[PDB]
Design a protein around this ligand. Structure first.
Ligand code: 6RE
Ligand code: 6RE
Ligand code: 6RE
Ligand code: 6RE
Lengths: 343, 343, 341, 343
């Protein structure tokens, strides 16, 4: 299948084992920004669901399938590949909805639906939006969407902006310099110091930050879920030209995302920006190997290239340059293994 | 057809060795001065056991233990490591000018081919509750390369268990599961999964430290002699116990820690993770009862701790506890692979 | 009679036995807030008693009748159905007020009075105000009240407000976990865990608390004793709509009450709010079996429904929901069986 | 019936409402002394239950019937008059003992049991042993007992001892002196002080105390449950002659009780003595209206006369004299309404 073609068995076993735990469902369900906003998007656009046929890609416990029911849906197909599907079935029965919700265990790339649907709902966003590569399953599910169909969420905006954080940058060499000692119990470790540094800079940093560290208006890369195909996400090239508002050293790029539910009654937004209440997605920062000096008025131009990998994530390639000086930096990051720095 | 692959799901093995390929994880283990300092003491203080001898280091990681044997005069050390950390070991061997003595042999100890039998095997195979990761079986499997006159460092391993009281910990876990009693979470009835939630939450071993005064009886000890034991002995580990209660109150579970002894020719050096000893990165492990048991001072608490090795490099743990006077009984299952790090 | 029709004899026996004890009269009288405020309301409004006919419903030891005598009342009929009525007569004689205070033994729904009165006085408030159902006896007595007569107290305000208090929550959940044991002395009790949680959470929690646990401004439900008819208190439906001020878990609703003595000279208030000095009424809190979550700005809507029962108390029904999310909590309470904490 | 002829209906309604609460069953079941001893006496005398027919009088939740089944009883009739019987039926079904335990809802004086039983078990002791007058229901059930049957408990002993507690005696007047003031908000209350004093003295005090306040070895009155008839408890005249071990003022009499399970294998004792762990029965003390001075070696003689009343309790008539001096005091207490003083 398409899923197994793009995924190492080892990665998938652990991925779906992780999501079979109720404590993880509870974690996602207890994010009120997430759960609240989805419920509002669906209920405030009841006309997009009333008496319609719905598909819920990766329903977990089925919470989004119940909001669709509250909105007046006629039939909801809830697809879930982990063992959480067993618990979703229990909740459909205990809530007297077996007539309107059908739980289909399995991967959305492999199950079969009995009819086409009017709208697909899902929550496929990972870290930096794209982590987990579940947006490809969301788009893959469009093979069941009528030409009339809508997508909830409808679009996705990735935002990237240069930041300054001297203490975050310095923390990397503080940790790596453990290896730069010539007699750790009589053993000279210094030969591995460069490797340790490299390892730390290859981790995206997951936490939040004061918006004042940002040095320029963000650049926006949009994914239109109504028009995009799975292949469009195998290689995501994000060019950027930042016009610096403050002078200082740029230590990397900060990432966040928004999604919009574009309904017939209104559009509802779900934002993980550092200016909005915190969510379980936090924000993501990718450091440059060497900081770049820029002054207010200069331009910072380059590209952020995301290359999907068979571990359900992306290899990140960032190259940036101050146009007025030619000073250049880059970095390679493995989004699968981020550093969770939040306290 | 290797012994390792026959007892290990591929998915678990891949992630296991990816996890230990990280230098940041080597740092965490090496920076535990109790671990690294005691291992060096046991080796250097028993240098006669290593002078001009052949050594095998099972799971050398970065190679620290192999360096200790080189300091003690070992004639030749074979350092086996299956993760990509093996290549980092080689770098340290070259930069420390020990290429004539330390031979890194990459691969699994169940699959490599050593050129000769060895006088002594050294390893640090202890996980949480001693037995997690199932590396003791690889340690014992390596005895096929050990001369009949040889030794094991560590030589024996003691598992200690004792009953404890801690209502806050018990209520802390039951609090998390009350989420799934909700009759109307955003209008959805979750109560049907309250049973499934409590089972999942009370399947998690609690890894952290605690005050020794929560222990309500003298610990029971279960000893594994690594010189005598056979690989197959660790597929099923049955630990009966009978505690003489020193205090009255509620028994909320059993606490677990372990000691290992390096029984050398010059002296025996002990490495302990007991709560009366300085904290290590192993901490201590506590298994909770879903329903606490009451006992008075003078009563006896008896039962069995049974560990069944699973294909995911861990153990499924069943604990049955009974106060003999009243017949009050508590049966509990725990997934040692997925613990709650509470510290 | 009206009283016997709405009261199991079994309840009435114990009820009036309880109030026949001097020790229980000492308890109420030593509440200086209660006793001092009643005296202040009566004496400050002495013109509403000067040379007037008075009726004191459920006088107990007769303390309120003496206050009316101090204010110049010409004649005070003091009705008391327990044996305490004879103790009141002793005090009337020892204080040399036989010319002004006339103890009438019996239930106010069954005694005859020589004449009509100008003002009724009484202390009929119980826990959560309505417990004991004496407000109906207080209102029933209005058959003896002249037109345009006054009522002391004149009105009663009930205040509701959501609160957060996880300790009280898992405290009542702890007691209930005893019935989850699958082997108590070898016996599986778990089949009764549902009945245990229900029973334990039907008990109102009577105690005081810090005002900072309240999550919204209180909602007020007023009872006008001058206008209300006793039948109005058989089924009390109190709608509420709170505007949440803080985000967090709502573990239930807190109840207190104030009464106002609206006299000719002055309006005197007697409050049992948590912002005010504690009284023997304390405050009341009704726990949800499952807490509700709400963010600051959300609205919590529902109704508190009180159905009076034949045991001189009420069956309480509280249904509350977070309007934005549909999170709903339905809970029942037996006001007759409180938990003094 | 016999129950209704000796009980006022108002008293009966509140009595069985009280015991319909699970919270009250837990209160008695959580007394380890009560529940642990009953279990011990039944199991350690298993020969008195194996393949026998049993009657549990006032089973409550049925805990004692389960103990009887643990001992191997063939058939157990469990009689309970309150609505707790329906809960007992649930536990019988949930413990898979519907073939051994049959719950009979109703009063033991009124229900119809088909056959004679081999042994009757019950926990009918109240404050001072006799409060609640349930011992008469226990003896009344002997109409179903074979002539060779047994009773668990077999016998009951009530112990009387003189005590000194100046603080307790004075506490009465401090409370009653609230009324001895000429202007309480302008009201002379002093006319009711005598009535307040009398009221406090008619109340037995339920709480514990330090054994050191006892001034003589206790006097013991025994009820042999195999021999007694329920009519023997309508009027219980207990003559006492105490030999004073200490000199001082005697303020009243203290009461506790023991019961013994005289089985075929052994005799097990359940004590509520002040020298033993505290139970939910505490102890009881009745004050003299005037204290009596007695020297060590003197004798304090008199009678404690308990007269049953229609409120499932007793009126207590105590009369005491110092033989050597001729000083007398007495009191007449209402056991149905005690003063709970324990803190
Ligand atoms: N939104 C996230 N970042 N994570 C939630 C993913 C949820 O969708 C489920 N899921 C992920 N991929 C798939 C798929 N291809 N088919 C079905 N369910 C899936 C997964 O088991 C979990 O319940
Ligand atoms: N001491 C621990 N609890 N864990 C450390 C395990 C270390 O041994 C390595 N290791 C584990 N099992 C094996 C094996 N069968 N063969 C070789 N190396 C192994 C692993 O890669 C890591 O470096
Ligand atoms: N305020 C309270 N919570 N209780 C006060 C009740 C007092 O009034 C008396 N009382 C209660 N109901 C009645 C009644 N219907 N008629 C007369 N006295 C009554 C009761 O005996 C006690 O003295
Ligand atoms: N041991 C005590 N002091 N009290 C226990 C009283 C228990 O016996 C029950 N009980 C009391 N009298 C009777 C009776 N005549 N018939 C049946 N059950 C009774 C009562 O319902 C409660 O469960």
């Amino acid at each position: 299948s398409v899923f197994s073609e793009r995924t190492e068995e080892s990665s998938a076993v652990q991925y779906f084992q992780f999501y079979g735990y109720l404590s993880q469902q509870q974690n996602m369900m207890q994010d009120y920004v997430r759960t609240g906003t989805y419920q509002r998007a669906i209920l405030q656009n009841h006309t997009d669901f009333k008496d319609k046929i719905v598909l819920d890609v990766g329903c977990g416990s089925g919470i989004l399938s119940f909001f669709a029911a509250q909105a007046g849906a006629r039939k909801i197909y809830a697809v879930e590949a982990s063992t959480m599907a067993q618990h979703a079935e229990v909740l459909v029965k205990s809530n007297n909805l077996t007539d309107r919700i059908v739980v289909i265990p399995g991967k959305v790339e492999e199950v079969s639906l009995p009819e086409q649907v009017d709208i697909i709902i899902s929550e496929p966003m990972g870290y930096m939006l794209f982590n987990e590569r579940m947006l490809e399953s969301y788009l893959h599910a469009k093979k069941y969407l009528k030409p009339s169909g809508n997508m909830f969420p409808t679009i996705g905006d990735v935002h990237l902006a240069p930041f300054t954080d001297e203490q975050l940058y310095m923390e990397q060499f503080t940790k790596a310099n453990f290896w730069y000692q010539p007699s750790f119990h009589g053993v000279d470790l210094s030969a591995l110091r460069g490797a340790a540094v490299d390892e730390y800079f290859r981790q995206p940093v997951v936490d939040t930050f004061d918006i004042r560290i940002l040095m320029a208006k963000s650049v926006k890369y949009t994914v239109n879920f109504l028009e995009a195909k799975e292949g469009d996400l195998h290689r995501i090239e994000i060019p950027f030209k930042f016009h610096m508002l403050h002078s200082g050293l740029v230590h990397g790029l900060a990432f966040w995302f928004d999604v919009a539910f574009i309904g017939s009654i209104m559009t509802v937004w779900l934002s993980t920006a550092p200016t909005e209440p915190l969510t379980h997605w936090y924000q993501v920062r990718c450091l440059f190997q060497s900081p770049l000096f820029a002054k207010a008025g200069d331009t910072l131009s380059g590209t952020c290239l995301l290359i999907a990998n068979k571990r359900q994530s992306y290899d990140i390639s960032i190259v940036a340059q101050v146009d007025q000086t030619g000073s250049k930096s880059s970095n390679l990051l493995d989004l699968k293994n981020p550093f969770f720095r939040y306290t």
